[PDB]
């Protein structure tokens, strides 16, 4: 029911239910299951396994009454954040907010002074696909009837928005910002808000050297020993215990 | 919950949630709301208002315990029938079947001996869009996780399949066969199975002269005075009371 709803939402968001093909820049269920393409029209690129991970983490924080809001840093068309809001709706949770943090202009051009690994990737060149306006994201929330007071937006570059984001505590921090600098700025500003029992999800860890660098360096610097658990061929997560 | 699920299902089936454009043979919400286009990819052409009518009728027969199975005669990609099965699932109804009746080859070519109104329309020429195989319909049910024992298929021309269909009683009869002959063959064979309290839905009444002819003639012949109620700019329905 809530369970039928969330099951269907995952299938709709990833576009498996309507066999949404990969972006011009075929549909293969095995590829979509692991989030290994960019859907032409669907609302998230993270795939079924990473959507299921969001569901499991958010349901666990609700079931264990771990305090805090939910956030995604790097949202594209908004589908992962739509799922977060839908899970709250399914469980009639009225006292948590979903924070939708993005430039709404794609990946920054890190320039000559960027982290070497970020410069080498030149991921801003992918902005023809990766830049999605806030108006489009809002419309996507409205399409699911989920644009309401429990959704809040943090538009701008993370280095500008996250230090002053008016978030008190976080139960789930989902990071999907593609660069060393984006990931570092997310962890430095938002990890201290994560409650004990809460989760940090790293979208692109195994196959993204600069993202792997940022996560490992932050964890080493702050002696975070909570183990990284895999999700699929790309993502990992951990639960904060201390 | 069941209600969140069914709300989302209607939006997914019609393709409003992902703004599915009209078939090559733009997306406009007002057009999709009234079922006035053929979606490029979505699973039904009947639109939001006609999907909502199915929901209301099926929920009413469940809530009033009107006996019988559910059937659609003319299914295209299967979306109206997927909704019927989903409503049963949402309410944990295990003792009704959804019957999916179609040629799976599009509209018949009525030939020189067809009803004059059917011959003039030459709707078989639209089969490039209207012919959808049973394999495709089955796959669509599977995409929603709704292909199970409570879905049954009646493949073939209605004149061949309906006289011997092993249906005992019907709580909802949804007719969407586009022709005088299709509509007449549906009513003659299946209306006698409709329980008191059950519903007959006519997809294409107001703007389809041959369909209007068949429904009105059948109702006049059998003295059916239960009033026709409108749905949108096209469909009507009635409830059997006697
Ligand atoms: N430093 C930064 N500041 C703001 N937005 C950033 C950023 N680095 C990356 N982004 C954003 O990160 C996103 C990467 S794609 C995110 C995919 C999304 N989680 C999904 O469910 O499909 C883009 O929307 C991009 O604009
Ligand atoms: N005499 C007949 N026998 C079998 N199938 C028929 C028929 N006349 C029309 N059809 C079928 O009627 C359908 C019309 S389109 C139906 C639309 C569908 N109800 C929806 O939800 O989108 C086609 O699939 C066509 O194959």
Swiss-Prot record, chains A, B:
Catalytic class of the enzyme: transferase
GO molecular function: metal ion binding; methyltransferase activity
Alphabetical list of InterPro entries matching this protein: SAM-dependent_MTases_sf (IPR029063), TylF_MeTrfase (IPR008884)
Cofactor: Mg(2+)
Pfam families reported for this sequence: TylF (PF05711)
Binding site for Mg(2+): 176, 203-204
Enzyme Commission number, as recorded: 2.1.1.285
Keywords: Antibiotic biosynthesis, Magnesium, Metal-binding, Methyltransferase, S-adenosyl-L-methionine, Transferase
Catalytic activity reported: desmethyldescarbamoylnovobiocin + S-adenosyl-L-methionine = descarbamoylnovobiocin + S-adenosyl-L-homocysteine + H(+)
Catalytic site: 52
Pathway(s) it belongs to: Antibiotic biosynthesis; novobiocin biosynthesis
Annotated binding of S-adenosyl-L-methionine, by residue: 44-45, 72-76, 102-106, 158, 176-177, 182
GO process annotations (BP): methylation; novobiocin biosynthetic process
PANTHER family in alphabetical order: MACROCIN O-METHYLTRANSFERASE (PTHR40036:SF1)
Task of the protein: S-adenosyl-L-methionine-dependent O-methyltransferase that methylates at 4-OH of the noviose moiety, the penultimate step in the novobiocin biosynthesis pathway. Novobiocin is an aminocoumarin family antibiotic that targets bacterial DNA gyrases.
Sequence similarity: Belongs to the methyltransferase TylF/MycF family.
Subunit text: Homodimer.
Protein's recorded name: Demethyldecarbamoylnovobiocin O-methyltransferase
Species this chain originates from: Streptomyces niveus
Lineage: Bacteria, Bacillati, Actinomycetota, Actinomycetes, Kitasatosporales
Gene name of the encoded protein: novP
């Amino acid at each position: 029911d809530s369970s039928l709803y969330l099951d269907l939402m995952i299938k709709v968001l990833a576009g498996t239910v309507y066999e949404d093909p990969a972006h011009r820049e075929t549909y293969r269920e095995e590829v979509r299951n692991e989030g290994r393409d960019w859907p032409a029209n669907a609302h998230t690129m993270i795939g079924i396994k990473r959507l299921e991970n969001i569901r499991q983490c958010v349901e666990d924080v609700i079931g264990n009454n771990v305090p805090g809001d939910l956030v995604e840093t790097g949202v594209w068309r908004g589908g992962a954040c739509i799922l977060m809001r839908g899970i709250l709706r399914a469980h009639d949770v009225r006292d948590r907010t979903v924070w939708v943090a993005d430039s709404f202009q794609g990946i920054p051009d890190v320039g000559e002074d960027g982290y070497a690994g970020d410069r080498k990737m030149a991921l801003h060149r992918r902005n023809s696909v990766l830049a999605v306006s806030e108006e489009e994201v809002r419309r996507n929330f409205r399409n699911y009837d989920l644009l309401d007071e429990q959704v809040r937006f943090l538009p701008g570059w993370f280095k500008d928005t996250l230090p002053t984001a008016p978030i008190d505590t976080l139960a789930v921090l989902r990071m999907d910002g593609d660069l060393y600098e984006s990931t570092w700025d997310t962890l430095t500003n938002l990890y201290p808000k994560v409650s004990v029992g809460g989760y940090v999800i790293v979208d692109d860890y195994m196959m993204c050297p600069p993202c792997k660098d940022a996560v490992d360096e932050y964890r080493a610097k702050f002696d975070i020993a909570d183990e990284l658990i895999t999700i699929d061929r790309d993502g990992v997560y951990w639960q904060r215990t201390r």
